[PDB]
Amino acid sequence: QVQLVESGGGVVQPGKSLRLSCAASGFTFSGYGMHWVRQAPGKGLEWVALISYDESNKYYADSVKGRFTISRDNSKNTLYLQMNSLRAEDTAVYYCAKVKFYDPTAPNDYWGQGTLVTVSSGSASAPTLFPLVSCENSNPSSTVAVGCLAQDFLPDSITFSWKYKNNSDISSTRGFPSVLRGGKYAATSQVLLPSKDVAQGTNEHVVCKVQHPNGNKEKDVPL
Amino acid sequence: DIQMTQSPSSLSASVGDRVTITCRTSQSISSYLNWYQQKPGKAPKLLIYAASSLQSGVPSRFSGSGSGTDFTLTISSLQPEDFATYYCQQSYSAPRTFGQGTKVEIKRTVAAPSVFIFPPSDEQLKSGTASVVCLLNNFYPREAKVQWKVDNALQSGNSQESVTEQDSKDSTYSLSSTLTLSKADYEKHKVYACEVTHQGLSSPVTKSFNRGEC
């Protein structure tokens, strides 16, 4: 089937440059125009640029005009997007989209998976975990809530995991989206444990684990 | 630039309901409006182009109409898979513009949030920063207002919210607000209050603690 695969995304500081690739397959790449559409984290879709099948016409969104540059290699069936003078504003998932037919108004019928382009002045780092224990514990509830605070990480690619003291997975986990705390991200996780006597006893604590490209870390959260 | 205005921002509906999303443009785009559907973590899918032409494979329960400046998307009868975010796009002029999106969420019964407050770990305090965390669990609708009151003084600018996606099992949401202060500022305050006001609470519930009582 028609497959489009972007690549080239990464963590980069402002002023720097990056170059995306979109490998097309399953269709006559050379016969269609291609578009680059970005989507800022938690926001709408924003059109970046387009290039005609014959490479004659190339248009860009006002915000990227002069900084980005679109191109294609009809022989390699690859579309490119050269991103220069990256600003924090450009942080987003970049999708390359094929148009449906030979017409200026043609709809983007096939989209790629996208690449995350995180532009921050902070440096990529693994999160700093801190335990979140309810003040005086959650006694007036059938479930004591302990949490885990992951902070100062970049890029926004973390996965929380919880294991009981006996090293087995915890089902009652809540994962919250990451908030941008000045260049870096911070995220929270929460576990709801049955206070009904089994609030602790033997299990003096639980284990909070986080996955991250720059380093997986864990912490013990007291019960 | 052709400004696209989409309404409503979000709409609660149940399977079987007829849905109608509207998209309006600041200037005529004469029927060249496209409708895309997007689910969390996935790429947009083309549903309708040229205001009313259905893309190959798109179910017939989807239909569009309109011209010039007012277009609408109608889902004759929502199905479980139709709950997603929908965008309208204008491919009449370059730059191509998109609507802000319309999230079609599952209609659920009102639920009061289980609020919780967590004080910063000593480890974190020793390192210079204080993160007071307030987690609201399983509530509905999404409209919940958390307010930080440090010593009964309104806090603004140092709190950050994060709402989960509508829970797959119960159609509820959860929010986490984080008030971040520097160790020094934290220590010069006793009562840390998280005032939660939600459509399912007769009165604003406040969860708090006095620095050092735990």
Domain range enclosing A210: 122-223
CA atoms within a 13 Å half-sphere pointing along the CA-CB vector of A77:
13
Can you give the length of chain B in residues? 214
Q: Is the C-alpha dihedral spanning B15, B19, B23, B29 positive or negative? A: positive
**What is the torsion angle, in degrees rounded to the nearest 10, for the CA atoms of residue B163, residue B168, residue B169 and residue B174?**
0
The DSSP H or E segment spanning A165 is none
State how far the Cα of B152 lies from the Cα of A26, in Å rounded to an integer. 62
CB pairs under 8 A between A and B: 137
Q: Are A111 and B45 in contact (CB under 8 A)?
A: yes
Q: DSSP per residue over A58-95, as a string?
A: EEE-TTTBTTEEEEEETTTTEEEEEE-S--GGG-EEEE
3-state DSSP of B133-194: EEEEEEEECCCEEEEEEECCCEECCCEEEEECCCCCCCCCEEEEEEEEEEHHHHHCCCEEEE
A122 Cβ under 8 Å from any chain B Cβ: no
Burial zone of B157 (CB within 10 Å; 0-12 exposed, 13-18 middle, 19+ buried): exposed
Residue B186 φ then ψ, to 5° = -60, -50
Q: Are A148 and A189 in contact (CB under 8 A)?
A: yes
User: Of A121, A149, A182, which closes a domain?
Assistant: A121
Burial zone of A196 (CB within 10 Å; 0-12 exposed, 13-18 middle, 19+ buried): exposed
Shortest Cα–Cα distance, A95 to chain B (Å): 8
A134 Cβ under 8 Å from any chain B Cβ: yes
A-chain residues near B50 (CB < 8 A) = 105, 107
Shortest Cα–Cα distance, A107 to chain B (Å): 6
**β-pairing verdict for B154-155 and B144-150:** antiparallel
Nearest residue on chain B to A109, alpha-carbon basis: B46
Burial zone of B12 (CB within 10 Å; 0-12 exposed, 13-18 middle, 19+ buried): middle
Burial zone of B207 (CB within 10 Å; 0-12 exposed, 13-18 middle, 19+ buried): buried
State how far the Cα of B53 lies from the Cα of A13, in Å rounded to an integer. 43
Residue that is written with structure tokens 């989960």 in the block: B164
State how far the Cα of A95 lies from the Cα of A39, in Å rounded to an integer. 8
A-chain residues near B162 (CB < 8 A) = 176-179, 187-188
Q: What strands lie across the sheet with B144-150, from one edge to the other?
A: B154-155, B144-150, B191-198, B205-210
CB contact under 8 A, B43 and A111: yes
Burial zone of B122 (CB within 10 Å; 0-12 exposed, 13-18 middle, 19+ buried): exposed
Interface of A with B in 195-214 (CB under 8 A): none
Tell me: do A127 and A203 sit in the same domain. yes
Tell me: do A129 and A80 sit in the same domain. no
The DSSP H or E segment spanning B119 is none
The 10 Å Cβ neighbour count of residue B209 is 19
Q: Are A57 and A102 in contact (CB under 8 A)?
A: no
Q: What are the strands, taking DSSP E only, across chain B?
A: 4-7, 10-13, 19-25, 33-38, 45-49, 53-54, 62-67, 70-75, 85-90, 97-98, 102-106, 114-118, 129-139, 144-150, 154-155, 159-163, 173-182, 191-198, 205-210
**DSSP code at position B83:** -
CA atoms within a 13 Å half-sphere pointing along the CA-CB vector of A63:
15
Tell me: do A100 and A126 sit in the same domain. no
Tell me: do A73 and A144 sit in the same domain. no
Query: What is the residue type of A27?
Result: F
Q: How many domains does chain A have?
A: 2
**DSSP code at position A106:** -
State how far the Cα of A145 lies from the Cα of A134, in Å rounded to an integer. 7
Exposure class string for B37-74: b at 16+ Cβ within 10 A, else e: bbeeeebbbbbbbbbbebbeebeeebbbebeebebbbe
State how far the Cα of B136 lies from the Cα of B142, in Å rounded to an integer. 11
The 10 Å Cβ neighbour count of residue A79 is 28
Q: What angle is formed at CA B137 by the lines to CA A219 and CA B41, rounded to 5 degrees? A: 75
B44 Cβ under 8 Å from any chain A Cβ: yes
Tell me: do A83 and A165 sit in the same domain. no
The 10 Å Cβ neighbour count of residue A78 is 19
State how far the Cα of B68 lies from the Cα of B29, in Å rounded to an integer. 5
The 10 Å Cβ neighbour count of residue A101 is 12
Q: Which two tokens stand for residue B92?
A: 């009449």
> Residue A151 is part of a domain; what is its CATH number?
2.60.40.10
Cis peptide before B141 (omega within 30 of 0): yes
Tell me: do A105 and A177 sit in the same domain. no
Long-range contacts of A213-216 (CB under 8 A, 24+ apart): A213/A124, A213/A155, A213/A157, A214/A124, A214/A125, A214/A126, A214/A153, A214/A154, A215/A125, A215/A126, A216/A126
The 10 Å Cβ neighbour count of residue B177 is 27
A-chain residues near B137 (CB < 8 A) = 174, 190, 192
B-chain residues near A47 (CB < 8 A) = 89, 95-98
CB contact under 8 A, A133 and B118: yes
Experimental technique: X-ray
The 10 Å Cβ neighbour count of residue B129 is 20
State how far the Cα of B103 lies from the Cα of B142, in Å rounded to an integer. 12
A104 Cβ under 8 Å from any chain B Cβ: yes
Interface of A with B in 31-90 (CB under 8 A): 35, 37, 44-47, 50, 59-62
Nearest residue on chain B to A151, alpha-carbon basis: B131
> Which of A47, A110, A174 minimises the CB distance to B98?
A47
State how far the Cα of B32 lies from the Cα of B65, in Å rounded to an integer. 11
Q: Are B120 and A130 in contact (CB under 8 A)?
A: yes
Closest C-alpha to A83, from A57, A98, A63, A101: A63
Tell me: do A58 and A97 sit in the same domain. yes
Give me the resolution in angstroms, 1 decimal.
2.7
Can you give the length of chain A in residues? 223
Residue that is written with structure tokens 């709950």 in the block: B83
The structural domains of chain B, ordered by start, are: 1-107 (2.60.40.10), 108-211 (2.60.40.10)
State how far the Cα of A67 lies from the Cα of A87, in Å rounded to an integer. 10
User: Of A75, A97, A121, which closes a domain?
Assistant: A121
Residue that is written with structure tokens 């277009």 in the block: B71
Tell me: do A222 and A126 sit in the same domain. yes
> Which of B55, B101, B160 minimises the CB distance to A179?
B160
CB contact under 8 A, B178 and A114: no
Tell me: do A117 and A145 sit in the same domain. no
Q: What strands lie across the sheet with B173-182, from one edge to the other?
A: B114-118, B129-139, B173-182, B159-163
Number of H helices, E strands in chain A: 0, 19
> Which of B43, B91, B119 minimises the CB distance to A135?
B119
State how far the Cα of B62 lies from the Cα of B70, in Å rounded to an integer. 17
B-chain residues near A141 (CB < 8 A) = 114
**Residues preceding discontinuities in chain B at C–N > 2.5 Å?**
none
Tell me: do A54 and A164 sit in the same domain. no
Tell me: do A178 and A94 sit in the same domain. no
What separation, in Å, do the N-terminal and C-terminal C-alpha atoms of chain A show? 51
User: Of A121, A140, A169, which closes a domain?
Assistant: A121
| Coarse DSSP helix, strand, coil percentages of chain A, rounded to the nearest 5 percent | 5, 50, 45
Q: Which two tokens stand for residue A116?
A: 């995350």
> Which of B32, B95, B174 minimises the CB distance to A47?
B95
B39 Cβ under 8 Å from any chain A Cβ: no
Tell me: do A5 and A54 sit in the same domain. yes
Shortest Cα–Cα distance, B79 to chain A (Å): 22
Q: Which two tokens stand for residue A160?
A: 């929380």
Q: Are A15 and A86 in contact (CB under 8 A)?
A: yes
How far are the Cα atoms of A5, A185, B79, B188, B204 from residue A45, in angstroms, in the given order?
Answer: 18, 22, 24, 44, 36
